[PDB]
C-alpha cells in the first residue's frame, strides 16, 4: 500500500524572506492523515492558518503567495517543492513572519533538514490526482499543460532573452522514474538579473536577495564567485518552482507537466482549470505499491 507520510520529528530553521528581507523562524511539525500542508502565521494573535491549496493563492507576481483576508504567506514554492519531492502529505508549517526563508535559494536545505528529521508513514492510503485528459492554459507566448502519463514527469522550456545564456533557449525534462529530485533538481537556486533591479526596487521586491541565496547575473557575468551547481541550473530551478506550485493541488500528481515560459501565475491558472475540469482527473490510491506507477524513497 502507498501510505500517507508526515514528519517523524519537528524541523526548525532560521533565515530571511527573499522578497521582504525579514528574519523568519520556521518550524515544520507532524500532522494527522488528510491534514495536507497548512501554513501558520504564529507571530499573529490569534494564529492565522492557511492550507497550501490552489484556492488560497492570492498573488503570483515574483513568487507564489498564500492569502487569507489581509494575511499572507509569501514564497511557498521552494519549501512545497521539497515536500512534494519527498512525498510529505501532512505537515504544519509555522512561520514567525509573512515569508518562508529563502535559505540558499534552492530546496536543498529543506530536503536535508526534512530527511535529517526523518519521515513517518501513516496508516492511510496516499491519495493521488491522476490526469485523464490533456489540460492546457496559455496567455500570450506562455503555456502550461497537463498530459496523461503513468508516473510523474516535468518538462520546462524558456527563451530567457538574456546574454548570459549565449543565445540558447533553455530546456530540461525530468522523469521521477530515473531522476533523483534530491540530486538533480533540489540544489537549483533562484536567480536575479541586475537589469530587473530598477523594477524590483520599484515593487519593493527581492529585498533579501544576494549572491548568498541566489544566482545573480550582471549582463555576461554570473556574479557568484563559485559559479553554478548544474550547467542548466536556471531551467532546473523553473522545474523546482513548477513542482512546488503543482503541490498546491493538495495531492501528488500522476501525469506529465509541460511548461513553456510559464510562471507562478500560469502554473496556478493551470491548477484552477484542472480542478474545474473534473472530466480531466480522478483521485486514485494504490492498495499495492508493487503495481503503482510511482515510488518514494524509504522513509
Ligand atoms: C540581487 O540579487 C537578487 C535579486 C533578485 C532576485 C530575485 C529572485 N526572484 C524570484 C525569481 C523567480 C520568480 C523564482 O525563483 N520564483 O520562485 S524565477 C527564477 O522563477 O524567475 C526575484 O523576483 O528576484 C534574487 F534572487 C537575487
Ligand atoms: Zn523559485
Establish whether 162 is a catalytic residue. Answer: no
Q: Which residues line ligand 1 (CB under 6 A)?
A: 18, 62-63, 77, 190-192, 200, 205-206, 209-210, 214, 216, 237-238, 241
Taking the CA of residue 274 as centre, how many other CA atoms within 13 Å lie in the half-sphere pointing to its CB? 32
**Residue 156 backbone dihedrals phi, psi, to 5 degrees:** -140, 140
Ramachandran bin of 255, using left for φ above 0, alpha for ψ from -120 to 50, beta for the remaining angles: left
Residue 13: in which H helix or E strand, if any? strand 11-16
**Nearest ligand atom owner, CA of 235:** 1
Neighbouring residues of 211: CB distance < 8 A, sequence distance ≥ 6: 223, 224, 225
The Cα 80–Cα 241 span in angstroms is 9
CA distance linking residue 13 with residue 192, whole number of Å: 24
Q: Which of 82, 157, 214, 237 is the pocket-test mutation for ligand 1 (most atoms within 8 Å of CB)?
A: 214
Resolution of this entry in Å?
1.8
Grid coordinates of 296? 518514494
SS (H, E, C) 259-273: EECCCHHHHHHHHHH
Beta carbons of 281 and 130 less than 8 angstroms apart: yes
User: Which ligand has the minimum distance to the alpha carbon of residue 82?
Assistant: 2
User: What are the structural domains, with CATH classification, of the chain?
Assistant: 1-127 (3.30.230.20), 128-297 (3.30.1700.10)
Which is the closest atom of ligand 1 to the Cα of 211?
2
**First-residue to last-residue Cα distance in the chain:** 14
Cα of 174 vs its chain's centroid, Å? 15
The string of DSSP letters for 108-129 reads: HHHHHHHHHH-EEEEEEEPPEE
78 assigned to a ligand binding site: yes
Catalytic residue among 4, 188, 264, 269: 264
Give the separation between CA 152 and CA 251, rounded to whole angstroms.
Answer: 13
Nearest to residue 109, comparing CAs of 73, 81, 72? Answer: 81
Amino acid at each position: 500500500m502507498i501510505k500517507q507520510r508526515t514528519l517523524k520529528n519537528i524541523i526548525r530553521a532560521t533565515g530571511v524572506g527573499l522578497h521582504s528581507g525579514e528574519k523568519v523562524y520556521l518550524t515544520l511539525k507532524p500532522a494527522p492523515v488528510d491534514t495536507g500542508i497548512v501554513f501558520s502565521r504564529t507571530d499573529l494573535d490569534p494564529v492565522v492558518e492557511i492550507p497550501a491549496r490552489a484556492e488560497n493563492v492570492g498573488e503570483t507576481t515574483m513568487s507564489t503567495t498564500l492569502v487569507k483576508g489581509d494575511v499572507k504567506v509569501d514564497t511557498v514554492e521552494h519549501l512545497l517543492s521539497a515536500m512534494a519531492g519527498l512525498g510529505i502529505d501532512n505537515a504544519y508549517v509555522e512561520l514567525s513572519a509573512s515569508e518562508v526563508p529563502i535559505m540558499d535559494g534552492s530546496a536543498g536545505p529543506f530536503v536535508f533538514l526534512i530527511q535529517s528529521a526523518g519521515l513517518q508513514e501513516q496508516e492511510a492510503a496516499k491519495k493521488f490526482i491522476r490526469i485523464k485528459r490533456e489540460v492546457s492554459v496559455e496567455e500570450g507566448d506562455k503555456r502550461a499543460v497537463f498530459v496523461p502519463f503513468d508516473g510523474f514527469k516535468v518538462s520546462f522550456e524558456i527563451d530567457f532573452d538574456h546574454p548570459v545564456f549565449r543565445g540558447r533557449t533553455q530546456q530540461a525534462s525530468v522523469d521521477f522514474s530515473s531522476t533523483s529530485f534530491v540530486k538533480e533538481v533540489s540544489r537549483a537556486r533562484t536567480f536575479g538579473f541586475m537589469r530587473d533591479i530598477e523594477y524590483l526596487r520599484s515593487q519593493n521586491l527581492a529585498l533579501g536577495g544576494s549572491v548568498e541565496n541566489a544566482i545573480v547575473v550582471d549582463e555576461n557575468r554570473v556574479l557568484n564567485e563559485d559559479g553554478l551547481r548544474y550547467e542548466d541550473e536556471f531551467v532546473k530551478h523553473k522545474i523546482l518552482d513548477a513542482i512546488g506550485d503543482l503541490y498546491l493541488l493538495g495531492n501528488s500528481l500522476i501525469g506529465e507537466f509541460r511548461g513553456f515560459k510559464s510562471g507562478h501565475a500560469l502554473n496556478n491558472q493551470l491548477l484552477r482549470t484542472l480542478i474545474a475540469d473534473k472530466d480531466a482527473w480522478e483521485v486514485v490510491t494504490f492498495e499495492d505499491a508493487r503495481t503503482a506507477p510511482i515510488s518514494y524513497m524509504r522513509p
